[PDB]
Amino acid sequence: KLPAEFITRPHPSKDHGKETCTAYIHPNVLSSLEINPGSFCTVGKIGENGILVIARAGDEEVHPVNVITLSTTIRSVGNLILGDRLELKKAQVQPPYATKVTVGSLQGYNILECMEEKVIQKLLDDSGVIMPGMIFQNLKTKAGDESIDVVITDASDFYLSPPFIFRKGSTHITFSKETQANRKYNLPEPLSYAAVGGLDKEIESLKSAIEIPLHQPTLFSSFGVSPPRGILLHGPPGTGKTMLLRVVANTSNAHVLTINGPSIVSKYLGETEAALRDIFNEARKYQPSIIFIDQIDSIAPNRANDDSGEVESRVVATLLTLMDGMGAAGKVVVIAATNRPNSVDPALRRPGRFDQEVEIGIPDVDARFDILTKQFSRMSSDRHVLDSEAIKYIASKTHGYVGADLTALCRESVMKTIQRGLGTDANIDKFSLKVTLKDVESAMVDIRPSAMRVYWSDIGGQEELKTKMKEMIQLPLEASETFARLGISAPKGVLLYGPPGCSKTLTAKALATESGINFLAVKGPEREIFRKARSAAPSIIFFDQIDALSPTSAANHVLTSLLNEIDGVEELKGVVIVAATNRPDEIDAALLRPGRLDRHIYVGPPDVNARLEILKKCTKKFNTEESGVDLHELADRTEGYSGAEVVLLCQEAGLAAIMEDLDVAKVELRHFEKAFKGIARGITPEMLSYYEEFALRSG
Amino acid sequence: KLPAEFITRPHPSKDHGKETCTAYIHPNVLSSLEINPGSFCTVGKIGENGILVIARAGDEEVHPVNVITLSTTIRSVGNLILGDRLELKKAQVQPPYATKVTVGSLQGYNILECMEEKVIQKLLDDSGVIMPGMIFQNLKTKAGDESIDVVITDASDFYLSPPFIFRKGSTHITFSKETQANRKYNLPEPLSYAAVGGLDKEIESLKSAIEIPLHQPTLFSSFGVSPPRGILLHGPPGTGKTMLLRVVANTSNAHVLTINGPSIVSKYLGETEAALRDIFNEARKYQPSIIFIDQIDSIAPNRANDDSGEVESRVVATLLTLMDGMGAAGKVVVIAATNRPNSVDPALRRPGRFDQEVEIGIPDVDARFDILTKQFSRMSSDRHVLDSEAIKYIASKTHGYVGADLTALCRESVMKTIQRGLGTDANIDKFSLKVTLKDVESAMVDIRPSAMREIFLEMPKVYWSDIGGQEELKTKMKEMIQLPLEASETFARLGISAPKGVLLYGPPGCSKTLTAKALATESGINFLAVKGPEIFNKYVGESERAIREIFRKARSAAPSIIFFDQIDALSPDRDGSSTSAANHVLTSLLNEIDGVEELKGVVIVAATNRPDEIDAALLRPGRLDRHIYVGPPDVNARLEILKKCTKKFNTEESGVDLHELADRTEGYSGAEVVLLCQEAGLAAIMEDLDVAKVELRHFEKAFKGIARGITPEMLSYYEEFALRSG
Ligand SMILES: Nc1ncnc2c1ncn2[C@@H]1O[C@H](COP(=O)(O)OP(=O)(O)OP(=O)(O)O)[C@@H](O)[C@H]1O
Ligand SMILES: Nc1ncnc2c1ncn2[C@@H]1O[C@H](COP(=O)(O)OP(=O)(O)OP(=O)(O)O)[C@@H](O)[C@H]1O
Ligand SMILES: Nc1ncnc2c1ncn2[C@@H]1O[C@H](COP(=O)(O)OP(=O)(O)OP(=O)(O)O)[C@@H](O)[C@H]1O
């Protein structure tokens, strides 16, 4: 036989004392591994560490050969989750007697009802062998009818920790509050809801979805057939799937399995059917079982494409038949993780299989603040400044991106702080080092957001349109009672017409920044994107070009034909909608009727304030005191040029400087003069006059 | 040898002595398994729990090693059908002795004439191994009834069923009445023509066509005619074809072999046809065996297609040879399920291969009602207080719903009921919450028909009260679309069919599509919307394909209505016929509405702004026979529209009689007054924001803002186009 794989399972009957340090290995396996029942053996996940618990005969033969029963206390020491691989090693080192051990309490209660006439004996009757974990749940110990947890944090006198057998008189018992085990052994710590981010709605939905079949499957089976079993997690990558599934597996006492998917299927062999059947049979063997699937889309892509694969078809068919035959009254739940909803196979994403859909939204500034505070609390904050206002400012300054590799920002900030402190103090101890915020800001700028592959100070705005934009974003939304009682349709935005080089893009960026909600621009020449507007709900949608689709050509025709369905969807929830155009005369006559485009606003060159702000922002990279520019003469000279030619001027000046004196420390007026003379009068007056005529005829 | 698989087989004789706990295993494999004859072995389907049975020596030679022999009883424990996969394990556990057991036969009234000892002697021969699933014959001498049987219920004291050891002294048998098997053991319930219904003409025909070859070959031999070889079951997806195959396999004791789609094909050359040959040889080894093929279209497509290749042609050729070759013969039947028969190779669809073709159709109202009744009776008593009229109403509310979607609807209703039980009832016991009409009414949302997924858009929620128009048009349209449906027998005796056509010509903003969208929303029948320029494509023939697909979907989705948006966009180039695309589109439209193939369920409704370009071919009776002026509405309709619009406004506070406003509204068109009211509201909220009462100032501002908008020349043209008929 040679069993090279073993699993774990909690013992029944709720054994006390004798439950610890016992591994009821099969007698055939026990004799095969030349280990006596009265001997110490190493049980644990392969290649990681060991626990050194005493093996057992196994009592009756009704138990499966592969599985060995272990108590929950031992498993929690090395974070041995249900269904983890186990390995037995014959060699053993005699454990020395424990001396001057120390014990702690997980809860905050300390020095209360210190009887110790049975607690000390408890550490002796449980077959000895004291581990740093010692998660105690046996008997009923309390002080005023309240459960408490006792942890033997440390015992100092290739495994998780050296084995020590407790002795009645050779060691002294000291009690203190630690709330955690000693960090010298660096034992794994199970994840808790305190360490993870907030995600209140998502975590609540996931908890309800997991809980509903878990505790009452009999009622679902009696009421009907095919209860919900499949749970699908999708959204943007990096938001957290492996971490949350690990958390929900740790918090549950049911059997779990790790199914990556590439390892389950054997390439060019077609053994995925047998592998999946064996996995599901093992899951069905134990009533409490959890099925975890990672990257299900990669395992089973869409069947529409001819390149999906015959092995993909086989695995889809076997998954379908196994889900059909898994039964209804069983207490089984399947959790599937996928990268994008589009890559999910359409047959799998059908009613009756994955109805309970769980999605993780893009974290906002509040979620970023919450996760930052949670991480700072988890990290040792004996020195780090709390600074709620600083955290809020950092979160607001950061561009809106999903909670991906956010801990990497803290890691690189710590690295920068270490590098600064080493040079500052000539290799001093960490306790004397100081942590600042400039390094964190520099690291955050360097790493940059990776979600895609603007600020009100960065991009200015015109005051004339500020009141109108505020009205459009507030009155329909902030006070909808008047519209509801008067039956008045929402304005549904306005039409902005202006030259490509004017401040229309600047106005759009100012609107986006003032809204405070991230958005993706929709190109003119470029159904799925439009459908996502309703699903998200509170957001902003902007169209860069509408003139092309107003009257490629096929894409423009499709967009202008589907705009009719867009209006119907937008009628129910207008929220806010804006668009831009270059040829106003191409717009449809039926699109100018009241109730869809109530008002039309003309946009032109940026004002003096916006021009000054843009000049200051583009000069921020350069220097102002050495250059001597007042940031106003340039604006006066190039007021009518365009709203974006200043970037070209700065680029030309920088290029001239770097080709005239190589590395640059200051920028002289000669480069600016050359840039100004290079390009003159980019805009045209005739097209602006046409815009003015259109504005006049509009009303 | 290394035998890693086993197959169940029946005993040649009834084996009156040892019906139960008998499994013949070859001595060679048994010796290699280190299992003695007096040792228990668990056997069961792969991926499921096993059933323990005592090992038995094989019947000398001429006995296959792979097969394991059972007699009608061990197979029925886990609903093991002949030909299913089996797995053998050497792990055995001694079971406790049985005590206080009860036996009750299904389909039989509680009677005490069994003498209570003849059944006991049968249990003595069992010699242990007592499980809740046992099926016997009880011989004879029982009320003179030949077709009776007895089944054990359970016993009151990692296996599919709990095994107990029978003892005559302490058996303590008690008689009781109960249906099928106990649900607390989660045993596989043997289904036999319970869920499938509404296709009697088809299901009994299939049953006869399956029964006659296998069970009555003597008449075929005497008549000199070859028995049927293959039956093809083709139909729309979600019609229960796989369920039909499963039930027809379960209802018979045949050696079924199942292959499901691309699960057999592989990139390795010489493997798909080898597996098919092995399957056919195994089927031919046993006379009563049945071969089942699922998704034959994806396995053996047409060779005429240029994208097929060579492996597809080879697999098609080997399938044809195995079905009918010089050396290919037997006493087997092949069942193939597919969605489209066109993709199937014509050589496969030959009377020698597939003489009988089964065309599964979309369930009708009676079939849907039968399926719903069966689904609701599946849970039997103690719930479902709804009577037959509620089920009939639910069935009538669904038109294009396939049988697959009804199970999903029931599951959604159940889960919604469970979710609602956590709210107001505050986690009360679910044994008394039962099922109400409100639950299914709420669950009716967020579910779509299987064949009506992609082309369906967001459902409008506009009713009759929201819209306002002339009563004549709405009454005529309601009567035209409801009389064939409300009273079909009246038209049957009268011998008059539906007009199937109607045209609405009028000026824009004349209340035409709104009277159609609201009708589609209220009626509840399937609705299809076709836009004007949407069908127009640069490539020639794409529009024709789209129109044909839309018409086929309408035909296959029960009687419905097709409404065209901006049908005036297509025209014969305004003079004669020059562009080929427009002429082809028009000709295809006429052919689809009325051509060689006759369609009656769907009713065509269209609205055109300018009927001048519509030729007499489209205007002839039988396509767009009905014509309605659909001009401006009367004073009452406009007054109702204004009252509905003013209903949001404080009518009591304002106190205006709006009679002069009614006249002013009559002075304009339909959408013009709505735009006037919207612009007046916008002007009011821009001038003095919210107002408790709307005065005449804002209304006059709207009147001066929007002037005219309609010219009388089109009104005169419509009047003459309505009056020149005579
Ligand atoms: N909500 C969160 N709260 C706290 N930390 C988080 C959160 N989401 C992500 N993280 C951090 O980011 C890491 C990335 O998450 P995880 O390892 O679960 O990957 P994933 O997003 O599921 O994977 P993939 O890149 O394949 O989409 C986590 O290990 C954790 O450190
Ligand atoms: N006529 C019917 N009566 C009762 N239940 C039905 C009927 N048709 C379908 N169902 C239910 O809907 C399910 C869907 O059918 P099934 O999965 O067997 O596929 P199918 O309809 O044969 O289609 P496909 O071609 O996609 O395999 C069935 O398992 C059954 O529960
Ligand atoms: N009786 C009415 N009540 C309310 N609104 C109306 C009425 N008649 C017209 N309208 C308004 O005018 C629009 C056009 O009317 P309708 O839906 O009848 O279009 P139609 O006659 O099919 O014409 P087309 O689609 O070619 O513009 C409606 O969507 C609605 O906003």
PDB file of N, CA, C and O and ligand atoms in Angstrom, chain A residues 195-197 199 237-243 295 339 371 375 403 405 407, ligand 1:
ATOM      1  N   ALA A 195      -7.918  41.624  11.668  1.00  0.00           N
ATOM      2  CA  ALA A 195      -6.778  41.888  10.796  1.00  0.00           C
ATOM      3  C   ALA A 195      -7.202  42.259   9.380  1.00  0.00           C
ATOM      4  O   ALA A 195      -6.541  43.083   8.739  1.00  0.00           O
ATOM      5  N   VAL A 196      -8.286  41.670   8.878  1.00  0.00           N
ATOM      6  CA  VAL A 196      -8.726  41.906   7.506  1.00  0.00           C
ATOM      7  C   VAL A 196      -9.357  43.288   7.404  1.00  0.00           C
ATOM      8  O   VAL A 196      -9.648  43.928   8.421  1.00  0.00           O
ATOM      9  N   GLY A 197      -9.571  43.756   6.176  1.00  0.00           N
ATOM     10  CA  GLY A 197     -10.219  45.034   5.978  1.00  0.00           C
ATOM     11  C   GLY A 197     -11.695  44.987   6.321  1.00  0.00           C
ATOM     12  O   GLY A 197     -12.267  43.934   6.605  1.00  0.00           O
ATOM     13  N   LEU A 199     -14.821  45.930   4.531  1.00  0.00           N
ATOM     14  CA  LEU A 199     -15.685  45.282   3.548  1.00  0.00           C
ATOM     15  C   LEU A 199     -16.994  44.813   4.171  1.00  0.00           C
ATOM     16  O   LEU A 199     -17.358  43.639   4.046  1.00  0.00           O
ATOM     17  N   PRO A 237      -9.047  42.235  -9.922  1.00  0.00           N
ATOM     18  CA  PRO A 237      -7.978  41.452  -9.295  1.00  0.00           C
ATOM     19  C   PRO A 237      -7.256  42.242  -8.215  1.00  0.00           C
ATOM     20  O   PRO A 237      -7.127  43.466  -8.284  1.00  0.00           O
ATOM     21  N   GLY A 238      -6.783  41.516  -7.205  1.00  0.00           N
ATOM     22  CA  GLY A 238      -6.044  42.138  -6.121  1.00  0.00           C
ATOM     23  C   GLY A 238      -6.905  42.600  -4.967  1.00  0.00           C
ATOM     24  O   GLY A 238      -6.372  42.984  -3.920  1.00  0.00           O
ATOM     25  N   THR A 239      -8.227  42.571  -5.126  1.00  0.00           N
ATOM     26  CA  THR A 239      -9.137  42.967  -4.059  1.00  0.00           C
ATOM     27  C   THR A 239      -9.141  41.995  -2.887  1.00  0.00           C
ATOM     28  O   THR A 239      -9.562  42.375  -1.790  1.00  0.00           O
ATOM     29  N   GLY A 240      -8.685  40.762  -3.091  1.00  0.00           N
ATOM     30  CA  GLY A 240      -8.642  39.788  -2.019  1.00  0.00           C
ATOM     31  C   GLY A 240      -9.623  38.650  -2.198  1.00  0.00           C
ATOM     32  O   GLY A 240     -10.825  38.811  -1.966  1.00  0.00           O
ATOM     33  N   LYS A 241      -9.123  37.496  -2.641  1.00  0.00           N
ATOM     34  CA  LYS A 241      -9.928  36.278  -2.703  1.00  0.00           C
ATOM     35  C   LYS A 241      -9.287  35.175  -1.871  1.00  0.00           C
ATOM     36  O   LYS A 241      -9.974  34.550  -1.055  1.00  0.00           O
ATOM     37  N   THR A 242      -7.987  34.924  -2.040  1.00  0.00           N
ATOM     38  CA  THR A 242      -7.286  33.871  -1.316  1.00  0.00           C
ATOM     39  C   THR A 242      -7.294  34.146   0.181  1.00  0.00           C
ATOM     40  O   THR A 242      -7.497  33.231   0.987  1.00  0.00           O
ATOM     41  N   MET A 243      -7.072  35.401   0.562  1.00  0.00           N
ATOM     42  CA  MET A 243      -7.091  35.804   1.962  1.00  0.00           C
ATOM     43  C   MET A 243      -8.456  35.620   2.609  1.00  0.00           C
ATOM     44  O   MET A 243      -8.544  35.084   3.718  1.00  0.00           O
ATOM     45  N   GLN A 295      -9.171  30.145  -9.265  1.00  0.00           N
ATOM     46  CA  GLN A 295      -9.047  30.397 -10.701  1.00  0.00           C
ATOM     47  C   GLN A 295      -9.880  29.396 -11.507  1.00  0.00           C
ATOM     48  O   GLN A 295      -9.377  28.675 -12.372  1.00  0.00           O
ATOM     49  N   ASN A 339     -11.197  35.417 -11.660  1.00  0.00           N
ATOM     50  CA  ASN A 339     -10.615  36.743 -11.845  1.00  0.00           C
ATOM     51  C   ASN A 339     -11.646  37.730 -12.382  1.00  0.00           C
ATOM     52  O   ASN A 339     -11.966  38.727 -11.727  1.00  0.00           O
ATOM     53  N   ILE A 371      -8.744  50.220   6.177  1.00  0.00           N
ATOM     54  CA  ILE A 371      -7.743  49.166   6.049  1.00  0.00           C
ATOM     55  C   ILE A 371      -6.379  49.660   6.520  1.00  0.00           C
ATOM     56  O   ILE A 371      -5.603  48.900   7.112  1.00  0.00           O
ATOM     57  N   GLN A 375      -4.322  47.869   9.504  1.00  0.00           N
ATOM     58  CA  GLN A 375      -2.945  47.409   9.355  1.00  0.00           C
ATOM     59  C   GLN A 375      -2.026  48.067  10.377  1.00  0.00           C
ATOM     60  O   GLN A 375      -1.129  47.414  10.922  1.00  0.00           O
ATOM     61  N   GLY A 403      -7.899  47.539  -3.530  1.00  0.00           N
ATOM     62  CA  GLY A 403      -7.012  47.207  -2.432  1.00  0.00           C
ATOM     63  C   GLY A 403      -5.996  46.135  -2.771  1.00  0.00           C
ATOM     64  O   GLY A 403      -5.931  45.098  -2.106  1.00  0.00           O
ATOM     65  N   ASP A 405      -2.012  44.980  -3.264  1.00  0.00           N
ATOM     66  CA  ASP A 405      -0.656  45.203  -2.762  1.00  0.00           C
ATOM     67  C   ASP A 405      -0.525  46.495  -1.963  1.00  0.00           C
ATOM     68  O   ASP A 405       0.493  47.188  -2.051  1.00  0.00           O
ATOM     69  N   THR A 407      -0.285  46.624   1.289  1.00  0.00           N
ATOM     70  CA  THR A 407       0.738  46.370   2.298  1.00  0.00           C
ATOM     71  C   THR A 407       2.139  46.571   1.733  1.00  0.00           C
ATOM     72  O   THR A 407       3.079  46.857   2.486  1.00  0.00           O
TER      73      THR A 407
HETATM   74  N1  LIG C   1      -9.749  43.622   2.337  1.00  0.00           N
HETATM   75  C1  LIG C   1      -8.458  43.453   2.643  1.00  0.00           C
HETATM   76  N2  LIG C   1      -8.064  43.681   3.916  1.00  0.00           N
HETATM   77  C2  LIG C   1      -6.776  43.515   4.229  1.00  0.00           C
HETATM   78  N3  LIG C   1      -5.765  43.140   3.441  1.00  0.00           N
HETATM   79  C3  LIG C   1      -6.183  42.922   2.190  1.00  0.00           C
HETATM   80  C4  LIG C   1      -7.479  43.052   1.715  1.00  0.00           C
HETATM   81  N4  LIG C   1      -7.539  42.742   0.364  1.00  0.00           N
HETATM   82  C5  LIG C   1      -6.301  42.439   0.061  1.00  0.00           C
HETATM   83  N5  LIG C   1      -5.427  42.526   1.114  1.00  0.00           N
HETATM   84  C6  LIG C   1      -3.995  42.255   1.095  1.00  0.00           C
HETATM   85  O1  LIG C   1      -3.594  42.063  -0.252  1.00  0.00           O
HETATM   86  C7  LIG C   1      -3.171  40.697  -0.459  1.00  0.00           C
HETATM   87  C8  LIG C   1      -3.696  40.200  -1.785  1.00  0.00           C
HETATM   88  O2  LIG C   1      -4.900  39.435  -1.564  1.00  0.00           O
HETATM   89  P1  LIG C   1      -4.953  37.887  -1.869  1.00  0.00           P
HETATM   90  O3  LIG C   1      -3.606  37.276  -1.481  1.00  0.00           O
HETATM   91  O4  LIG C   1      -6.126  37.253  -1.233  1.00  0.00           O
HETATM   92  O5  LIG C   1      -5.050  37.832  -3.457  1.00  0.00           O
HETATM   93  P2  LIG C   1      -6.208  37.788  -4.548  1.00  0.00           P
HETATM   94  O6  LIG C   1      -6.667  39.228  -4.782  1.00  0.00           O
HETATM   95  O7  LIG C   1      -7.266  36.826  -4.182  1.00  0.00           O
HETATM   96  O8  LIG C   1      -5.413  37.327  -5.847  1.00  0.00           O
HETATM   97  P3  LIG C   1      -5.268  37.712  -7.393  1.00  0.00           P
HETATM   98  O9  LIG C   1      -4.091  38.603  -7.603  1.00  0.00           O
HETATM   99  O10 LIG C   1      -5.158  36.365  -8.117  1.00  0.00           O
HETATM  100  O11 LIG C   1      -6.607  38.366  -7.755  1.00  0.00           O
HETATM  101  C9  LIG C   1      -3.662  39.933   0.766  1.00  0.00           C
HETATM  102  O12 LIG C   1      -2.818  38.822   1.048  1.00  0.00           O
HETATM  103  C10 LIG C   1      -3.587  40.994   1.864  1.00  0.00           C
HETATM  104  O13 LIG C   1      -2.269  41.129   2.383  1.00  0.00           O
END
